[PDB]
Design a binder for this molecule. Sequence first.
Ligand SMILES: NC(=O)c1ccc[n+]([C@@H]2O[C@H](COP(=O)([O-])OP(=O)(O)OC[C@H]3O[C@@H](n4cnc5c(N)ncnc54)[C@H](OP(=O)(O)O)[C@@H]3O)[C@@H](O)[C@H]2O)c1
Ligand SMILES: NC(=O)c1ccc[n+]([C@@H]2O[C@H](COP(=O)([O-])OP(=O)(O)OC[C@H]3O[C@@H](n4cnc5c(N)ncnc54)[C@H](OP(=O)(O)O)[C@@H]3O)[C@@H](O)[C@H]2O)c1
Ligand SMILES: NC(=O)c1ccc[n+]([C@@H]2O[C@H](COP(=O)([O-])OP(=O)(O)OC[C@H]3O[C@@H](n4cnc5c(N)ncnc54)[C@H](OP(=O)(O)O)[C@@H]3O)[C@@H](O)[C@H]2O)c1
Ligand SMILES: NC(=O)c1ccc[n+]([C@@H]2O[C@H](COP(=O)([O-])OP(=O)(O)OC[C@H]3O[C@@H](n4cnc5c(N)ncnc54)[C@H](OP(=O)(O)O)[C@@H]3O)[C@@H](O)[C@H]2O)c1
Ligand SMILES: Nc1nc(N)nc(NC2CC2)n1
Ligand SMILES: Nc1nc(N)nc(NC2CC2)n1
Ligand SMILES: Nc1nc(N)nc(NC2CC2)n1
Ligand SMILES: Nc1nc(N)nc(NC2CC2)n1
Ligand code: NA
Ligand code: NA
Lengths: 247, 248, 248, 249
Amino acid sequence: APAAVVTGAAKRIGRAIAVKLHQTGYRVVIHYHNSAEAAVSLADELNKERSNTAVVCQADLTNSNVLPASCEEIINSCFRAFGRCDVLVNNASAFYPTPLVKTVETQVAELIGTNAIAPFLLTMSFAQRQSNLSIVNLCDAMVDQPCMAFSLYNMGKHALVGLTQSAALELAPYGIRVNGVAPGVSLLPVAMGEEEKDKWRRKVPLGRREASAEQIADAVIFLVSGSAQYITGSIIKVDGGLSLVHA
Amino acid sequence: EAPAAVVTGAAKRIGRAIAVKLHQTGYRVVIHYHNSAEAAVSLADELNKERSNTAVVCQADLTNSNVLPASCEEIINSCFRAFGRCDVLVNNASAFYPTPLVKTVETQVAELIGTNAIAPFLLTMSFAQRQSNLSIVNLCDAMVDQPCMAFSLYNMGKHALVGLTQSAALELAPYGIRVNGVAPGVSLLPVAMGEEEKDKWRRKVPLGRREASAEQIADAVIFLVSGSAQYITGSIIKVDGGLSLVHA
Amino acid sequence: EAPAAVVTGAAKRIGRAIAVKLHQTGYRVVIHYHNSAEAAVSLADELNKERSNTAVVCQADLTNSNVLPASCEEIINSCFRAFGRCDVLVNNASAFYPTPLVKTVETQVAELIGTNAIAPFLLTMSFAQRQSNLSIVNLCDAMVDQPCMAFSLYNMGKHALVGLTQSAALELAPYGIRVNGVAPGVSLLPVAMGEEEKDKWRRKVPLGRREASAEQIADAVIFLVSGSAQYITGSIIKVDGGLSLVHA
Amino acid sequence: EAPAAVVTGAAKRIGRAIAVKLHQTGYRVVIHYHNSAEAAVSLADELNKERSNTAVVCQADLTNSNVLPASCEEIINSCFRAFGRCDVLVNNASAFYPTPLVQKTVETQVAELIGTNAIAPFLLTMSFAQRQSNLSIVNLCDAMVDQPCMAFSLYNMGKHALVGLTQSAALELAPYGIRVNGVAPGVSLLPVAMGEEEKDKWRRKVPLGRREASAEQIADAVIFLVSGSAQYITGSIIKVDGGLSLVHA
Ligand SMILES: NC(=O)c1ccc[n+]([C@@H]2O[C@H](COP(=O)([O-])OP(=O)(O)OC[C@H]3O[C@@H](n4cnc5c(N)ncnc54)[C@H](OP(=O)(O)O)[C@@H]3O)[C@@H](O)[C@H]2O)c1
Ligand SMILES: NC(=O)c1ccc[n+]([C@@H]2O[C@H](COP(=O)([O-])OP(=O)(O)OC[C@H]3O[C@@H](n4cnc5c(N)ncnc54)[C@H](OP(=O)(O)O)[C@@H]3O)[C@@H](O)[C@H]2O)c1
Ligand SMILES: NC(=O)c1ccc[n+]([C@@H]2O[C@H](COP(=O)([O-])OP(=O)(O)OC[C@H]3O[C@@H](n4cnc5c(N)ncnc54)[C@H](OP(=O)(O)O)[C@@H]3O)[C@@H](O)[C@H]2O)c1
Ligand SMILES: NC(=O)c1ccc[n+]([C@@H]2O[C@H](COP(=O)([O-])OP(=O)(O)OC[C@H]3O[C@@H](n4cnc5c(N)ncnc54)[C@H](OP(=O)(O)O)[C@@H]3O)[C@@H](O)[C@H]2O)c1
Ligand SMILES: Nc1nc(N)nc(NC2CC2)n1
Ligand SMILES: Nc1nc(N)nc(NC2CC2)n1
Ligand SMILES: Nc1nc(N)nc(NC2CC2)n1
Ligand SMILES: Nc1nc(N)nc(NC2CC2)n1
Ligand code: NA
Ligand code: NA
């Protein structure tokens, strides 16, 4: 059985991706930062289905002097548990506004670390340890029509597009594919107000609703599958047409 | 009962692989063709041997002309006539040849722009006008921003097809019709292409230094028409082995 | 001696402003028009009052048809007959109206795809064939990836024009002919559009909550044809006040 | 009074060309530099001999660190100290070197490549805006970001982030009348460290003249963007690449 690492997998979209990978037959490493209880509850659920097929792994993915070592250890955790690491899903992400007009350098470390630098370091560590091997990066369908006052977040997501492309090119000779999935509106942020959630939903052409986490996870499953073996450097929007709607 | 799909230019090559994979997934298929009558009938016979009354052929020229709207309406009609429904449209048929800036040019326009862009638009119109998982898949080109030299009309047509994909995704979303694309890089090389040229293209592809099989292209089409793509509309999936990421 | 430019659809609105600014920069101009003869002639008279023998008009329908290649060749020829040279081509003329998926459709195709894409292609062919700072500027649309609802053929035509811009840039670079685009967002609105509707569009624009003047669009054209742009080819400059960056 | 501009990494090469062209257009200029003190001072001396008290130098490292926000604030402050205003910011400074995925610390490479190409532009943009006619920012991008050089992931990441900043900042700063645009070279001045045969390999790829862009050609697009001829243009990135990005593998 192949094995996958999913970052930020205790809740929401990460959780659904881990669940669907496990349902497909993968053993999974459930990475978490603060959500230890949820991470272990997910592992307990998956291990009840198939013993010793899910483990948890804690790490902060904020940029720092220790982030390279932390990312090496996440990949190492998959090898320790399962003896291989076939799939990496870069899902973990900080998301909050950073107006141009926490210290700003902490915001940099968190927003650019989680969205871009940790994915890069995890990609390095994944590759260095190297079958259907692939990486899937969780992008953002709205990167070119960004939310107001979210410059660092947007920078991080653009950087992640860059990594997707650069790593697809560089890792192709190792048979490692690198792709992305770009939600528009999926599970709305827990802190967003109801009326705000509804305003976003009403903008989506395809059903005037957000994507379920499972719909996002379906695109991840496709990209890691045998049915995507010639696909690398591609980013699949799963956005219900939202990015096509003008102001 | 079983859903039904129209695949244009389905007698050979990628369209044939798409038709076969849709049929294997459970669809009844309209095999559109232009000149390749014997291949189209042979494919229909193959599919009907597997499940009777699940494949028919439909002949049409998709060159632009004043009768092209009627021709595209008749392809969609032919699906309803055979199967009583039309769930999926795959716009695959395509003319591809150079048109240097420096057949008459009017014919070149009609063929390249008609097959790659206008016929998809008219088929899209007719599909939409006539009707649980409805979708359209347009065969695009991953290299449209790094185009082949002296292929301006072809490239224009494929860019127009991106525009149609996006515009139709937006407009047809309220009807539950998703509209997406699949963009090959190099897949089955042109029959006309010489061996050395084919080898030069193959050697450019990062992932495996080989072209895509027809089946690999069809796999992306199958995903986009499936239940696993129900929130996906207006997306174009490159299936190019990284080719478009390679600088000059 | 003075360079010469062809501007399509130059009688009114953005094309007129472009022709004026090119003339102010020192170009002789061919004012192409279709229906707006009186305005074309008035512009020519104004320009020739400023400097005699510097402006001529040229009538043609740019709808797609069997005669469009000849018509386009004639427009280019008119610049050579008048001025002895043709240094700049500005593809500005454009039909724009909705074509819902759900006039006959073949005429809509001819008009929308002809004016926005096929006539630019044929004009580009004829320009190149007759061939220093030579360049072509195509009037694109900054909103082509977030298009107006029910404008599929228009959007297809503008996408095709992006592809032409790219393809022609690549192919014509060895002749030193640069090919670029200018992409307005909201510029001149219909005069007859109610101000309340105009204001809905204006309020969308981040930079000043107003539409671009024709002259602001023309400024970008002037840059691209200038000596300050001699390494720029295949580039499309948005002149949109940030509109294309604004989400739904 | 004459307007004032800050050009990062302006001692040499493209940045100097931009500073020179802005100065010739009537701007007073802050010549930011990191290690090239001699070159920076030489340029300032030359510009002040054309017009007295119209150029100053400003030294800063633009590597990311917890003091980078203060350093960026101080570059903008230096423009106001010398000239009383700051109308234009050109984010030109850039680290550029490979970072292979498979095998000087990686954290240093992150701090340099992401800091110079993205974070310092962001912080300078914040400081520029907080301190405020024809105000604008021009970011030096890269026309090849979607067809990147092999083994340059962190550089490419940085330049993609800079695209994101250009767009985000154009949106957010539009109500302040600050336009934010980019200029994206393909091949311009080749690296000093490259041999002529390798330079020629790159030159031969360029459809328009089989040559790199001069520094002045890049600067010409910057000057257009800061000019009155670009007053409705924001969020736009102009490729100045001779068609290079249109050429397939
Ligand atoms: N939801 C949407 O509509 C949407 C739209 C566009 C893009 N996306 C992208 O899709 C992905 C999943 O979205 P989501 O909404 O499910 O994400 P989310 O709930 O915002 O974040 C996912 C997880 O990231 C982890 N994380 C955050 N900061 C971290 C840090 N410093 N170190 C390590 N891990 C950290 C958290 O793990 P712990 O809980 O364990 O601390 C969190 O549960 C993200 O990449 C997001 O950007 C989502
Ligand atoms: N192969 C590749 O590497 C590649 C690369 C990029 C994109 N694509 C796209 O993928 C699709 C499939 O590629 P392919 O190589 O399999 O295509 P293809 O063999 O060039 O053409 C497919 C079929 O199009 C039909 N067709 C051509 N002109 C027509 C006309 N005037 N009216 C009606 N039908 C017409 C032909 O049908 P008859 O034989 O019955 O006459 C032909 O067999 C095309 O859209 C192509 O542009 C392919
Ligand atoms: N206005 C905007 O906000 C906006 C936004 C985005 C892009 N653009 C682009 O900018 C350019 C100029 O826009 P505009 O608003 O000034 O254009 P416009 O007023 O819609 O049209 C310009 C001219 O095109 C000519 N034209 C139309 N159909 C033709 C045909 N069949 N044959 C020949 N010529 C034909 C007409 O010439 P006659 O009057 O002589 O018949 C007309 O005056 C266009 O390419 C447009 O798509 C404009
Ligand atoms: N040259 C090309 O072909 C090309 C192609 C694509 C994009 N571009 C972009 O165009 C811009 C100019 O290119 P270029 O070739 O002229 O650049 P460059 O010579 O590589 O670098 C410009 C300057 O950046 C400064 N810099 C580097 N690291 C720094 C740091 N840690 N802190 C502060 N400043 C630092 C250096 O200043 P000091 O010398 O004072 O240390 C250097 O002179 C860059 O943004 C580049 O990415 C250029
Ligand atoms: N990390 C990230 N990124 C986006 N775009 N949206 C969200 N959504 C909610 C914070 C949970 N999360
Ligand atoms: N229609 C089309 N389009 C492309 N890109 N390639 C091909 N390949 C060869 C004519 C079969 N055909
Ligand atoms: N995008 C576009 N294209 C043309 N040809 N004309 C127009 N006219 C504007 C609605 C007045 N807009
Ligand atoms: N900063 C930067 N960025 C690019 N692309 N090219 C260059 N040339 C560098 C001096 C070698 N520098
Ligand atoms: Na830790
Ligand atoms: Na008239």
